[PDB]
Amino acid sequence: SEQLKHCNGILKELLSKKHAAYAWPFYKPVDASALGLHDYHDIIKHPMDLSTVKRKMENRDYRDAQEFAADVRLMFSNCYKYNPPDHDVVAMARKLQDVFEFRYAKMP
Amino acid sequence: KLSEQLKHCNGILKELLSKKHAAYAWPFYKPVDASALGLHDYHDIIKHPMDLSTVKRKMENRDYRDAQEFAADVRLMFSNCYKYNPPDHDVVAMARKLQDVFEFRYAKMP
Ligand SMILES: Cc1cc(-c2cc3c(=O)n(C)cc(-c4cc(C(C)(C)O)ccc4Oc4ccc(F)cc4F)c3o2)cc(C)c1OCCO
Ligand SMILES: Cc1cc(-c2cc3c(=O)n(C)cc(-c4cc(C(C)(C)O)ccc4Oc4ccc(F)cc4F)c3o2)cc(C)c1OCCO
């Protein structure tokens, strides 16, 4: 509950403008419809992005910091699972995760 | 089943401690010898240490009910690295590079 106020702090930093170069594809859920990804939801069974995570933080859905991470990592995993590992979205994901895991480990 | 999950978690561990990734995998092969490295506070800051040999033993001993628990320890390993070290330092770059092989390999796992 005091540690969730930090998890919020992380989400805030994840969405700040510094990282926006590589963070943006995770602000909004994947638009599989528009991108023509007919198979996206057959493979990604539990979509997740940072907006969906924010709603949940607002709605007090995350009990501990562990549940918060679960979803944030799930975002990145969905990216690695669906996408060939060369593609740039993967290399951005990696970039953003690297910041995440930074702040999460630092968290008191 | 659930032991089909773990079969693949074995395949991931194998990859992680293999030939190719050795450049950046080696500081996680065995525990952090704080004593030797002159780290008078490592075990103060890191309450639950973790490394790949430890993971490997647990995988043999069958302490992991599922991949979800396996991942847990691997993530914990990388976490501790990131927790203890400032972000510039080289270990971290390697930690990061190995985590990227894992999440790749883990996320592919049918
Ligand atoms: C065009 C295309 C896109 C994607 C794909 C995967 C994937 C993904 O995992 N995430 C998290 C985000 C995107 C993505 C999302 C969006 C919107 C604004 C619609 O939400 C826009 C572009 C996206 O993908 C990118 C493609 C190339 C990039 F350099 C960067 C991207 F973010 C996204 O796109 C995957 C494939 C295979 C693809 O190519 C279609 C086959 O040629
Ligand atoms: C000497 C020293 C070492 C560490 C440190 C942190 C850290 C770590 O998080 N992991 C996972 C692994 C090592 C590490 C461990 C080992 C052994 C074989 C003893 O287990 C050997 C080297 C290690 O780290 C490196 C030190 C210097 C390098 F140029 C590269 C390293 F991988 C490791 O070393 C951190 C600091 C700040 C440090 O400087 C202490 C005062 O000089």
Swiss-Prot record, chain A:
Changing residue 35 to A: Reduced binding to histone H4 acetylated at 'Lys-12' (H4K12ac). Coiled coil: none annotated. Residues 1-107 form the Bromo domain. It is found in: Nucleus; Chromosome. Some specific inhibitors of BRD2 that prevent binding to acetylated histone are promising therapeutic molecules for the treatment of cancers or inflammatory diseases. ABBV-744, a small molecule, has been tested on tumors with success: ABBV-744 antiproliferative activity is mainly restricted to cell lines of acute myeloid leukaemia and prostate cancer and is able to displace BRD4 from chromatin. GSK046 (iBET-BD2), which specifically inhibits the second bromo domain, is a promising therapeutic small molecule for the treatment of inflammatory and autoimmune diseases. The first bromo domain specifically recognizes histone H4 acetylated at 'Lys-12' (H4K12ac). It also specifically binds histone H4 acetyl-methylated at 'Lys-5' and 'Lys-12' (H4K5acme and H4K12acme, respectively). The second bromo domain recognizes and binds histone H4 acetylated at 'Lys-5' and 'Lys-12' (H4K5ac and H4K12ac, respectively). Homodimer. Interacts with E2F1. Interacts with (acetylated) STAT3; promoting STAT3 recruitment to chromatin. Interacts with CTCF; promoting BRD2 recruitment to chromatin. Belongs to the BET family. Chromatin reader protein that specifically recognizes and binds histone H4 acetylated at 'Lys-5' and 'Lys-12' (H4K5ac and H4K12ac, respectively), thereby controlling gene expression and remodeling chromatin structures. Recruits transcription factors and coactivators to target gene sites, and activates RNA polymerase II machinery for transcriptional elongation. This is Bromodomain-containing protein 2. It comes from Homo sapiens. The gene is BRD2. The chain holds residues 347 to 454 of 801 of the full protein.
